[PDB]
Write a protein that binds this ligand. Sequence first.
Ligand SMILES: Nc1ncnc2c1ncn2[C@@H]1O[C@H](COP(=O)(O)OP(=O)(O)OP(=O)(O)O)[C@@H](O)[C@H]1O
Ligand SMILES: Nc1ncnc2c1ncn2[C@@H]1O[C@H](COP(=O)(O)OP(=O)(O)OP(=O)(O)O)[C@@H](O)[C@H]1O
Lengths: 235, 235
Amino acid sequence: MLGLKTSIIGRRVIYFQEITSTNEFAKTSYLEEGTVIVADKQTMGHGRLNRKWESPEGGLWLSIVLSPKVPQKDLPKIVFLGAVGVVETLKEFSIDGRIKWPNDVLVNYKKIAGVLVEGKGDKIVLGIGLNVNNKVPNGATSMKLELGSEVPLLSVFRSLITNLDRLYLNFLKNPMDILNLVRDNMILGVRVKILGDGSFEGIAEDIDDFGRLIIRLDSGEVKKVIYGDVSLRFL
Amino acid sequence: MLGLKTSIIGRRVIYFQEITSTNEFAKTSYLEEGTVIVADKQTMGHGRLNRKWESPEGGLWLSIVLSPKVPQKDLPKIVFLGAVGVVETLKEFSIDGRIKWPNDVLVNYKKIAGVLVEGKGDKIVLGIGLNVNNKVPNGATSMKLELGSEVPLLSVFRSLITNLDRLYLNFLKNPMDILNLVRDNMILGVRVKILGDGSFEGIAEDIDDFGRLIIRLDSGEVKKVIYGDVSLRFL
Ligand SMILES: Nc1ncnc2c1ncn2[C@@H]1O[C@H](COP(=O)(O)OP(=O)(O)OP(=O)(O)O)[C@@H](O)[C@H]1O
Ligand SMILES: Nc1ncnc2c1ncn2[C@@H]1O[C@H](COP(=O)(O)OP(=O)(O)OP(=O)(O)O)[C@@H](O)[C@H]1O
């Protein structure tokens, strides 16, 4: 009854009034590629760092089952598809979402959405949490808070699914195209701190042909940050 | 993201852009009670009397999984919950649908909805096909045709699910109530013919405590028709 017109993402949609985690359900269940898992609220959702993620009613909490048949070298770019998809949807609603490498979207440096990719073998789950009309923790923001008014959750869902489906299909054909889109919507040219095994600071210059974040340390040294267990902090 | 507030029916909804049959998927898949299977269109929909049911885009095609903890005798009345739910929804949209015993809803004698109940194992599958904005076979009708304008399909879904959830919760406690609702919304006091072997005709007087159609033949003989494979015609 939704009348979705997408090619792969959204061929099927499983909606829950409530769920522990859409990502966990997507990973565990036998589901066909393109299947979207969405819930009014998650009781046990986590972030990329495996930290607690608030998923109250009013927000958009979903996961997409994907099985891309692309080189293993491009696989780390799936997170970007999610982030760019959100940015585009936000632009449609006249909200200036900007990407914080590698998985966050911020509005005025306030977190409005987070993306989490998980995948054992051939099955890849693209998780997305977007604050729409829900209350948010300090520092974060939402579409409602930004526009000063409620936003039809379903409209945001329809918009996002449409963008993700387009970005995904093109990605299967042109895996590099996403990098340009990320580049144009990513927070760059400012100082950041990299928190991994220890830490270092520098200018976030750009992302390379592998999606790695390029940081220029004050000594002139250039480091390439591969996304995994690493945290980025703006100074 | 749908924000359904129902208690059982609609706790989970599985949507398909295309499917062979919602009832079939609902019969063969392990699904928790109250799960709703819905699709933009069915490629192999079928009816109460095994006639191919046309399910083009624009219509409301769904199946609901139930496992009513009620006495055996009551199990057969599930079809009426569907019929009445449709009638209540139609009324909300300013349409007067009347029940053609035992599973169809008509508007000015034109078929607008069909209910099909199947029970694989101990779970019951309530199938409902409602013509909203889709093209319909000659002689049939739709909410669009009745109202003269497109009808927000999701709005009809939300309304029907709300009514069915309420009707089902009461049925679990007071399984006899549904009969009264059917009586008050069914086509009675008119001549009908029961097709098949032993075919006969008479006046459709009422339905009894088992939901059997009570027919008075001209001889004065009274026959009670079970709602199984029965094929009925208005004269
Ligand atoms: N609804 C929400 N909106 C925005 N931020 C949230 C929300 N719920 C939780 N958070 C914060 O976002 C984090 C989400 O997961 P995670 O920490 O893994 O993200 P990250 O981008 O890798 O790290 P960071 O939060 O430091 O940017 C939580 O640790 C929490 O501090
Ligand atoms: N979407 C639809 N809207 C209206 N009528 C339909 C639709 N799809 C199929 N039909 C027709 O409606 C008929 C009625 O339902 P069914 O197939 O379950 O058996 P039936 O014996 O014809 O029932 P009835 O006595 O109520 O007409 C079908 O036989 C078919 O000709």
